[PDB]
């Protein structure tokens, strides 16, 4: 899936939140067009078993993922040492903001 950027397939696939509940995850899927993300709930119970339950099936980004912190920060890699960062507010809805600078 590397295309022209050899070694970029090596990336984190799983992020967790800093919310002291620790109750949900972010997961990255790769696709021919740059991937998707999923969100899962974690339910813990007196039955002594933990459930991992789907919430967000799909989520759409842009450049080649380095790392992500899940509100979902996405940090991306491009050629010649280039970068882009993106935020998305999710509510099912998505508001998006990227990074671009011309100096």
- Distance set, CA 87 to CA 75, 80, 96 (Å): 9, 23, 6
Is residue 8 within 8 Å of residue 63, measured between CB atoms? no
State the DSSP code for 32.
Answer: T
- Distance set, CA 103 to CA 16, 54, 59, 65, 98 (Å): 35, 43, 31, 24, 17
CA pair distance 32, 55, nearest whole angstrom: 23
Dig out the tokens for 67 from the structure: 């790392």
CA pair distance 38, 95, nearest whole angstrom: 16
3-state SS assignment for residue 44 = strand
Which candidate, 61, 20, 57, places its Cα nearest to that of 39? 57
């Amino acid at each position: 899936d590397i295309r022209q950027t050899a070694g970029t397939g090596h990336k984190l696939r799983l992020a967790f939140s800093e919310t002291l509940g620790i109750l949900y995850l972010g997961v990255y899927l790769h696709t021919p067009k740059q991937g998707q993300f999923c969100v899962f709930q974690l339910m813990c119970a007196e039955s002594n078993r933990y459930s991992l339950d789907h919430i967000s099936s799909i989520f759409t980004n842009q450049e080649t993922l380095i790392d992500f912190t899940f509100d979902i920060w996405a940090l991306w890699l491009d050629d010649d040492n280039q970068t882009v960062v993106k935020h998305i507010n999710f509510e099912q809805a998505g508001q998006w903001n990227p990074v671009f600078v011309n100096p």
